[PDB]
PDB file of C-alpha atoms in Angstrom:
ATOM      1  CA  UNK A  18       0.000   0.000   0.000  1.00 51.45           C
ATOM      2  CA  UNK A  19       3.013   1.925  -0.114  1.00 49.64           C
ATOM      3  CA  UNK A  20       3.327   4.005  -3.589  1.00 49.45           C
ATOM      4  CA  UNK A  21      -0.776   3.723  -3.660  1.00 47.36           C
ATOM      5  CA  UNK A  22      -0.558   6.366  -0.898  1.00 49.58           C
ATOM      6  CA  UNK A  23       1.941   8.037  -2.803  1.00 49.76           C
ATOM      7  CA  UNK A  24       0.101   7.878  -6.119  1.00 46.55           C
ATOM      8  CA  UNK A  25      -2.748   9.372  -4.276  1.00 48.55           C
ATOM      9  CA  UNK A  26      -0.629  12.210  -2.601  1.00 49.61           C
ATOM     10  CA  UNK A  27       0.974  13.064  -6.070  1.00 48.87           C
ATOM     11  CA  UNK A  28      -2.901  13.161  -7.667  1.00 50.66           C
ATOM     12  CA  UNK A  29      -3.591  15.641  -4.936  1.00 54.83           C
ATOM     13  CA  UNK A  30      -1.255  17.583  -5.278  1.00 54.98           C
ATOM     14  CA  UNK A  31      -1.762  17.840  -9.340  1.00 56.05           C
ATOM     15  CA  UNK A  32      -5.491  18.921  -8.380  1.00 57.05           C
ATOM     16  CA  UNK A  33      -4.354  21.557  -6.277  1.00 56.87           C
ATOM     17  CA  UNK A  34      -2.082  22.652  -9.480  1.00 60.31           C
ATOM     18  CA  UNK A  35      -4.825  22.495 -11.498  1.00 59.76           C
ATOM     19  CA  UNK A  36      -7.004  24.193  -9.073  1.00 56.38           C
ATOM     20  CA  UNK A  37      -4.897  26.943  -9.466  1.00 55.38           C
ATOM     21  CA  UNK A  38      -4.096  27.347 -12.938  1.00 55.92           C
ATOM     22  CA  UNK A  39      -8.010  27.682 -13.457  1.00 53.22           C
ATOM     23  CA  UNK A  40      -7.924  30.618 -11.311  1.00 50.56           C
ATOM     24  CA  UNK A  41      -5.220  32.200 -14.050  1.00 49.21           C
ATOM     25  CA  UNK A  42      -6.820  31.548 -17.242  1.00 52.07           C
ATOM     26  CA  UNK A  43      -9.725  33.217 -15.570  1.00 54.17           C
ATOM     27  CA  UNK A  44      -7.483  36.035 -15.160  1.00 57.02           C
ATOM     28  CA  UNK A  45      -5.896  35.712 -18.247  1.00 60.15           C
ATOM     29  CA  UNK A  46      -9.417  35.948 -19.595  1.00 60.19           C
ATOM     30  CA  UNK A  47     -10.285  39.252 -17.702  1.00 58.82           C
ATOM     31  CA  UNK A  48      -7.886  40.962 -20.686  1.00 57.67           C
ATOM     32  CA  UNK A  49      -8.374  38.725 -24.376  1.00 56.24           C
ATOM     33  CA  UNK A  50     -11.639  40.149 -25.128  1.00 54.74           C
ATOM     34  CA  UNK A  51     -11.235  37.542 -28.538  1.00 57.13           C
ATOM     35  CA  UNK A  52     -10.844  34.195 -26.344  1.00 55.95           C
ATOM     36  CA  UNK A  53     -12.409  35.155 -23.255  1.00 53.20           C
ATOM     37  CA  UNK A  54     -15.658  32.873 -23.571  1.00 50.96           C
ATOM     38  CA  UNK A  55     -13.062  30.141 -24.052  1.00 50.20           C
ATOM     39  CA  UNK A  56     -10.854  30.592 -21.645  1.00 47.63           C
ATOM     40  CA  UNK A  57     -13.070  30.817 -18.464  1.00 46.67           C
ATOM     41  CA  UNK A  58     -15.165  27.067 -20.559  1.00 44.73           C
ATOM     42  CA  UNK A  59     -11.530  25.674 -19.960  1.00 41.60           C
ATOM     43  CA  UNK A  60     -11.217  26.756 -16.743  1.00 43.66           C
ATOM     44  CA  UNK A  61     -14.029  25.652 -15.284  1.00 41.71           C
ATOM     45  CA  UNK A  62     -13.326  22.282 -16.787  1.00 45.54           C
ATOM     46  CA  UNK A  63     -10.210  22.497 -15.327  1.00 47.27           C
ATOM     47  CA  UNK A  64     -11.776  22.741 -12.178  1.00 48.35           C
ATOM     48  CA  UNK A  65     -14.288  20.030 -12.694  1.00 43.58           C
ATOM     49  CA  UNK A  66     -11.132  17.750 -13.283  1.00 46.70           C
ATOM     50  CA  UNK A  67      -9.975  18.512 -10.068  1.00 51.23           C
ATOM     51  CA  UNK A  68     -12.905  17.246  -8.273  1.00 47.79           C
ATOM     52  CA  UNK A  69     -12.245  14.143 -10.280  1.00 50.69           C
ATOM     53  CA  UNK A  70      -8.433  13.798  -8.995  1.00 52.14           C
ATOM     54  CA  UNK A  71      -9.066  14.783  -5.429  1.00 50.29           C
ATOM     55  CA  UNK A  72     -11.931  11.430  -5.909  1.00 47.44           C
ATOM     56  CA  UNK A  73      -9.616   9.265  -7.040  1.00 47.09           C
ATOM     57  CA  UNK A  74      -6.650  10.018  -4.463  1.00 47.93           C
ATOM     58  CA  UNK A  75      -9.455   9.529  -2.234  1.00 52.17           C
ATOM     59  CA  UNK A  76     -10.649   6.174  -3.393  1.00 57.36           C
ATOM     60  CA  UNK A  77      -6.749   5.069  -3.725  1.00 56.48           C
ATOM     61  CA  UNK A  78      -6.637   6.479  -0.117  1.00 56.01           C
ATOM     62  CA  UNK A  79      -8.563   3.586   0.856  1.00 54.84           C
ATOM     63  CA  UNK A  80      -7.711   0.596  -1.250  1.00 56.94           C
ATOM     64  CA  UNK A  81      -4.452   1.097  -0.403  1.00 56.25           C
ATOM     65  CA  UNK A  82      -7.457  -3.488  -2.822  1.00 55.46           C
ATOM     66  CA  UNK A  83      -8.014  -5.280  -5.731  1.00 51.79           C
ATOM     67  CA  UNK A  84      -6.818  -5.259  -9.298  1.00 54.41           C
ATOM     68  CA  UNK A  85     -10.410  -4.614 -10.485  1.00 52.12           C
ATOM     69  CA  UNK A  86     -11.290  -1.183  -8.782  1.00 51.27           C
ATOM     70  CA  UNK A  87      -7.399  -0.369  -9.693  1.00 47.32           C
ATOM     71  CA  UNK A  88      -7.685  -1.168 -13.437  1.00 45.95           C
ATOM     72  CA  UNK A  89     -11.001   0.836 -13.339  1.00 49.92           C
ATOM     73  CA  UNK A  90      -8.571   3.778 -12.078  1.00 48.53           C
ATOM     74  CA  UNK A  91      -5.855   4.270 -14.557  1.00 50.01           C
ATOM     75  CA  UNK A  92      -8.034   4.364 -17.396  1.00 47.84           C
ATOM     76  CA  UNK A  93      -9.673   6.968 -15.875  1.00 47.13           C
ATOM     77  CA  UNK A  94      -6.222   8.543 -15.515  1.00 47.24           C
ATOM     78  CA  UNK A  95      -5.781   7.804 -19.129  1.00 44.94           C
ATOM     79  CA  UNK A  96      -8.889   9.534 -20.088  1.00 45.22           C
ATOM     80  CA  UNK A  97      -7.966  12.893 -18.006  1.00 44.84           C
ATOM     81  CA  UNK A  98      -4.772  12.768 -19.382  1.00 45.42           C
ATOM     82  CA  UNK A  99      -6.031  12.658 -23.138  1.00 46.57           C
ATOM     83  CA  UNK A 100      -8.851  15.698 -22.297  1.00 47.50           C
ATOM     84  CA  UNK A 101      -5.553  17.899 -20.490  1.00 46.46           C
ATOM     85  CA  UNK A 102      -3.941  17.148 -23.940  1.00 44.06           C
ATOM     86  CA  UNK A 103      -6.705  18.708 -26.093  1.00 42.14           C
ATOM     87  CA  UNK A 104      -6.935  21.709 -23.185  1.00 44.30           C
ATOM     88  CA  UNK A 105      -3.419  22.324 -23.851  1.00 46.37           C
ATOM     89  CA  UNK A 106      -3.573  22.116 -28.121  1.00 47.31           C
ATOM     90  CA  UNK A 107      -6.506  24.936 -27.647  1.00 46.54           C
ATOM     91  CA  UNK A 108      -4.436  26.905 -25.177  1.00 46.13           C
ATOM     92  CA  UNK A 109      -2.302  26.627 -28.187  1.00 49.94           C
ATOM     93  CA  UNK A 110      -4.424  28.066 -30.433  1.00 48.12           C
ATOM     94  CA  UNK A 111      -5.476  30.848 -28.377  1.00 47.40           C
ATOM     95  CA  UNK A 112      -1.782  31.931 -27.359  1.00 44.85           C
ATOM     96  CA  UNK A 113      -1.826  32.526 -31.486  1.00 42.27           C
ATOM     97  CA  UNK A 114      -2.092  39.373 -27.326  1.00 38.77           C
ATOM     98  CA  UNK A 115      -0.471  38.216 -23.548  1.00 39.11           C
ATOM     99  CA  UNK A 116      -0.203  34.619 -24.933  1.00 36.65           C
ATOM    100  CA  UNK A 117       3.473  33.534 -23.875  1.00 37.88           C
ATOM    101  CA  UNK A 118       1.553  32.825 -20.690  1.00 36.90           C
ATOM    102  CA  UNK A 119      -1.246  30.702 -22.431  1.00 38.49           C
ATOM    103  CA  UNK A 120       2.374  28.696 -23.842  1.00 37.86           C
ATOM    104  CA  UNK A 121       3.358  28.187 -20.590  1.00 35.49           C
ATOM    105  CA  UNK A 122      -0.049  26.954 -18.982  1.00 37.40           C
ATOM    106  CA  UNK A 123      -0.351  24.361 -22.375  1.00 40.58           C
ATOM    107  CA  UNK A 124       3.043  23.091 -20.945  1.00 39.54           C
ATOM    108  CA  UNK A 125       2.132  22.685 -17.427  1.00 34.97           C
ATOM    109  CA  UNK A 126      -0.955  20.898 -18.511  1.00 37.86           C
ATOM    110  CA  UNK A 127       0.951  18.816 -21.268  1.00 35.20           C
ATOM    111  CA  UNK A 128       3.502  17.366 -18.143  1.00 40.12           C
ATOM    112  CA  UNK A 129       0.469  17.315 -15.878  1.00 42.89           C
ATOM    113  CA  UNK A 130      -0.723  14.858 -18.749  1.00 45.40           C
ATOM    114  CA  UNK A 131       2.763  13.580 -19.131  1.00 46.88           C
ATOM    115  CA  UNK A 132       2.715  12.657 -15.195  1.00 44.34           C
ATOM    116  CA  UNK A 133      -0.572  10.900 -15.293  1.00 47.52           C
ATOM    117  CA  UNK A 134      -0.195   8.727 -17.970  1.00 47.72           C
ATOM    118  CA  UNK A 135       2.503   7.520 -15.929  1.00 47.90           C
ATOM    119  CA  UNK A 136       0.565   7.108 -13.199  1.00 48.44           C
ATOM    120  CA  UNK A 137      -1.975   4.894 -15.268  1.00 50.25           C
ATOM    121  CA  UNK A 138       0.420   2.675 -15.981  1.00 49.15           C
ATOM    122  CA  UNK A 139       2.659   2.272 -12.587  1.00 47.94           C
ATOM    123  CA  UNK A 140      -0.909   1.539 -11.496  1.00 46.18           C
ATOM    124  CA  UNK A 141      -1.262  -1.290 -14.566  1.00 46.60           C
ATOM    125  CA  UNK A 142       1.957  -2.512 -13.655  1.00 46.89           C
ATOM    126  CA  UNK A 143       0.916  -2.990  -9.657  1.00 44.71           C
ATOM    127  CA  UNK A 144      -2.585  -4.385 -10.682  1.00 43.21           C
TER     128      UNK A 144
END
């Protein structure tokens, strides 16, 4: 039950990143008058996914098992990490007048992706 706690305890923590990086497209969205609809969708989305980390270093809290409820996990991991992709690719898009921060949040979110893909699959490899 060892790195399920510290899967868990790195999920939280990535919530709490992306907890917070919500709260700066919002700003960022306060001054693009051409993206700002956009930006503040993504960011509540951003927050929505969130909740769904802080549940599932919750539920890993606990099992901490059985290979089933595991399994079940990491794709959901997977699936995250695929919808942070397409987040980032927009971000992208937009960054195309303050944009070199919209760059930077993409890559954040592309290594936040990065990190749980990993995560899906040291959790494949315990189950």
């Amino acid at each position: 039950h060892m790195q399920l706690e510290e899967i868990a305890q790195q999920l939280e923590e990535i919530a709490k990143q992306l907890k917070k990086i919500a709260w700066q497209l919002k700003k960022i969205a306060q001054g693009e008058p051409s993206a700002q609809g956009q930006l503040e969708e993504i960011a509540q989305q951003l927050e929505e996914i969130a909740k769904q980390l802080k549940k599932i270093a919750w539920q890993l809290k606990k099992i901490a098992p059985d290979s089933v409820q595991l399994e079940e996990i990491a794709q959901q991991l997977e699936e995250i990490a695929k919808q942070l992709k397409k987040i980032a690719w927009q971000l992208k898009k937009i960054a195309q007048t303050s944009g070199g921060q919209l760059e930077e949040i993409a890559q954040q979110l592309e290594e936040i992706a990065k990190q749980l893909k990993k995560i899906a699959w040291q959790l494949k490899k315990i189950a």
